[PDB]
């Protein structure tokens, strides 16, 4: 998820 | 000066398993995760998971679910992909992709894994 | 499971012209903090993928300006204001918003003969 990764 | 090298190219016997490394440089290995990612001449990309190379946590798609296992060697900012109990299904390229600033913004080469007898 | 639906190829296009790839999401990808999840890739024969576009309309650092990216809801495009030859490639939507990761089938750019 990019919420998570970013 | 960011870079993924990955394994290069590999033939595999149907019931063995594969090992693909994906080694970093140019950011702290350490604080970005790092995606698999599958593509199949007759498909699309499919995503296999992601590990974060500090605590090594992990994170899959059930649909690889036992074949693929992530994991990392902080010591040469290298993670791994292993593919077991191959199958002619699992022909395909095999891309890592870490998340450095956004999504899979940075590519690894795209090995090419064959299994055939 | 989100599913991404792409064209096997976009319509052709003749070089200098302008061109837009379509994809359409399962369902939203907007997130509670307002960004829109989806992501664009393009992949250049004989090369690994590329990051175009991030969170539906933005450009990656390194992309050229004549790449745009918007959408509405559940359909997106992207857009390649003056196609040069550079540009030929399949592009891959993708969505980021939850697990599993997904992309579309990735759309062949075809150019007009």
């Known amino acids: 998820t990019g919420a998570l990764q970013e | 000066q960011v870079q993924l090298q990955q394994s290069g190219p590999e033939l595999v016997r149907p019931g063995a398993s594969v090992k693909i490394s994906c080694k970093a440089s140019?950011?702290?290995?350490?604080?970005?995760?790092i995606n698999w990612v599958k593509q199949r001449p007759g498909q699309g990309l499919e995503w296999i998971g992601w590990?974060?190379?500090?605590?090594?946590?992990?994170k899959y798609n059930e649909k690889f679910k036992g074949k693929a296992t992530l994991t990392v060697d902080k010591s040469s900012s290298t993670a791994f992909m292993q593919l077991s109990s191959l199958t002619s299904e699992d022909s395909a390229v095999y891309f890592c992709?870490?998340?450095?600033?956004?999504?899979?913004?940075?590519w690894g080469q795209g090995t090419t894994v064959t299994v055939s007898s | 499971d989100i599913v991404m639906t792409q064209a096997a190829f976009s319509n052709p296009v003749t070089l200098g012209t302008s061109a837009s790839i379509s994809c359409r999401s399962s369902?939203?990808?907007?997130?509670?903090?307002?960004?829109?999840?989806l992501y664009w890739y393009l992949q250049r024969p004989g090369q690994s993928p590329q990051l175009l576009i991030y969170?539906?309309?933005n450009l990656a650092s390194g992309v050229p300006d004549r790449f745009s990216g918007s959408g509405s809801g559940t359909d997106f495009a992207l857009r390649i204001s003056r196609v040069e030859a550079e540009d030929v490639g399949v592009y891959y939507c993708?969505?980021?918003?939850?697990?599993?990761?997904?992309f579309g089938t990735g759309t062949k750019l075809e150019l007009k003969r």
């Open positions: 590990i974060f190379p500090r605590n090594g946590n992990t």
């Open positions: 969170r539906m309309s």
């Open positions: 140019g950011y702290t290995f350490t604080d970005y995760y």
């Open positions: 369902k939203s990808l907007l997130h509670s903090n307002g960004i829109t999840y």
């Open positions: 992709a870490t998340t450095v600033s956004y999504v899979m913004d940075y």
């Open positions: 993708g969505q980021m918003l939850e697990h599993p990761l997904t």
